[PDB]
Amino acid sequence: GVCWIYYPDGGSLVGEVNEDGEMTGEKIAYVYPDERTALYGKFIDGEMIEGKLATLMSTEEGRPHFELMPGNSVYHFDKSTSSCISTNALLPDPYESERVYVAESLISSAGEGLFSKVAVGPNTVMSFYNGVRITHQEVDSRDWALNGATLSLDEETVIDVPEPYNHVSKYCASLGHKANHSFTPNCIYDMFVHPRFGPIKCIRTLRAVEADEELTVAYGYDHSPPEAPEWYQVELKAFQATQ
């Protein structure tokens, strides 16, 4: 009967597979890593065609029972390209929206930062880092002023949130690019397979975090190639002294 297929990050696809063993049907769901928030509806071979926001209320004999959320929030597989970040740049991720918000950073002169909405435990996925997909060659050969929000995805791809999409008034489908740097972070970047964004990275807590605590990540620039923006070099000197 029903099958659950988990990703390493804890998200899953669940439903009755078809005669070919594929996640294809009108009652398939992607379930986020809270094992509660779900996108339920039409999938073809595990690709989300029309996922409606739902809550996983219970399971019976392994079968998930959902309640659809009010409204008509629907989502589809919408992987970015080199030039298009999203078909719905202003449509937030529903899992992320209940976990983080953007506000002025507590770090001096650091602009906006990303904050926890609620108290969470260690190993909790908080936020998604989606962006356009460009090459290391393009990124490495341009000035640092353009590389504020670049995140390496793999050996071939860098994810970027370029102007003006680094303003939430123009892009808020994901918010991972809003987390500031710390050499003593409370989060890490981790691999994530998202039903809307595809293979991206996420921000995951490494320890318990309180409500309204700023989320920080080590940006992990090369210290001995330091190939890094000036503010990072300045704080690296500071960090190294406390050691």
Binding site: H136, V139, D140, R142, W144, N147, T150, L151, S152, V158, Y189, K201, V217, Y219, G220, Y221, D222, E227
Partner: peptide, 6 residues
Amino acid sequence: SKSKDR
């Protein structure tokens, strides 16, 4: 590399 987390 001019990107994070490489």
